[PDB]
Design a protein around this ligand. Sequence first.
Ligand SMILES: *[C@@H]1O[C@H](CO)[C@@H](O)[C@H](O)[C@H]1NC(C)=O
Ligand SMILES: *[C@@H]1O[C@H](CO)[C@@H](O)[C@H](O)[C@H]1NC(C)=O
Ligand code: NA
Ligand code: NA
Ligand code: NA
Ligand code: NA
Ligand code: NA
Ligand code: NA
Lengths: 207, 209
Amino acid sequence: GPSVFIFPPKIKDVLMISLSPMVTCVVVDVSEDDPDVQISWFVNNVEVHTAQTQTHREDYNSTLRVVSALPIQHQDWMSGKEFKCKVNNRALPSPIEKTISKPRGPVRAPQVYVLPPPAEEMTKKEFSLTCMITGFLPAEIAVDWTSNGRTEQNYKNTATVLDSDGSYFMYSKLRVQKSTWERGSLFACSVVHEGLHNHLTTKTISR
Amino acid sequence: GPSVFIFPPKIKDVLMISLSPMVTCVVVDVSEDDPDVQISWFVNNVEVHTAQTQTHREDYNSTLRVVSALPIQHQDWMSGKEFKCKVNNRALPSPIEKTISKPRGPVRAPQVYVLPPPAEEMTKKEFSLTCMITGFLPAEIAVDWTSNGRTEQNYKNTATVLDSDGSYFMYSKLRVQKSTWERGSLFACSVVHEGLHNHLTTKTISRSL
Ligand SMILES: *[C@@H]1O[C@H](CO)[C@@H](O)[C@H](O)[C@H]1NC(C)=O
Ligand SMILES: *[C@@H]1O[C@H](CO)[C@@H](O)[C@H](O)[C@H]1NC(C)=O
Ligand code: NA
Ligand code: NA
Ligand code: NA
Ligand code: NA
Ligand code: NA
Ligand code: NA
């Protein structure tokens, strides 16, 4: 029978004013036999009408998937409003309702350090800069690297890890060519998180 | 109906001759209407009778789960022998078999580095040491720390992550007391991997003396 998953906005979309956060309801395992699904949306129990809906056939398994995305405003998310989708379909005994909201909770800024390559690695052609990001709450975060305003396309983030502290940590590893490092370039680890002034901090390292 | 999952040994158990590596067959969704499950085990097609087999009740769901763990020899795993469990039940249209072995593939030793802590952190009462582990293949690795030669408790590991050259990396973070660090205590990140000589390396750090 059909199931419904509700998704919050991406952290970066809600913490940066130029972006476009979305709350999304996804209805999965809609039978070919009962294909018609009615989705309706609510913000603090007031019905709203701006959601964009798409329907995908999954012919291979005789099902369909319906995706409904509500475009939201950053302040409504940050102030705690409840976003609710109600899903109706003839194969359900009653409508399924899913709700989501920003959980109220403690907020700890991460400490962010950019660490140079180890001495033992300098003898190589390329090597690893480490962005260490510790002590943050809640777990939602975004971490990216740039150089001279160019997004580097060769870094890897670890998954976030719960520290024995109650807080979370992660690391991001940037691979850099020796030549780029020796010509004096600035590498910037930028971290987006609820704790940070203007929701953003950027730490830079070079030779 | 019932289904079967097979699991490999933990890498630390296999790489260390004092420990007891197991290969495990788990049978889920066994109906309490046909509760009896027979598991047999084979190592390159020869039947072995050393496994320990338990049944856990899941009465909330009128189901059972059967866990059969076969204690294996370290060299059978490492040399690529096939471990196989055959599962028989009354309600099964026919016996289910699962097989597992260690894939043959290239082996690249981990590069292990303990990163020196920033000065701002060392003035605090408690701070973090970071062990960075890169370029290893295969993914299976065990990482921990010692202080003065005794295995530490207060550390956390990241998951391994696939790097862009086809090797893996990870990081390990140990929490350290300033008072212990100032005492000149030795801190060591210990790494177990099949690519290392004697399957172990250590990298150490302490206060400047
Ligand atoms: C195929 O569809 C059924 C629903 O009719 C669902 O229960 C099952 O998970 C689907 N299979 C896969 C492999 O996604
Ligand atoms: C309850 O029993 C059925 C088998 O009859 C099983 O497939 C199902 O997964 C069980 N539900 C859970 C959550 O274990
Ligand atoms: Na909210
Ligand atoms: Na580094
Ligand atoms: Na540089
Ligand atoms: Na076999
Ligand atoms: Na094997
Ligand atoms: Na290994």
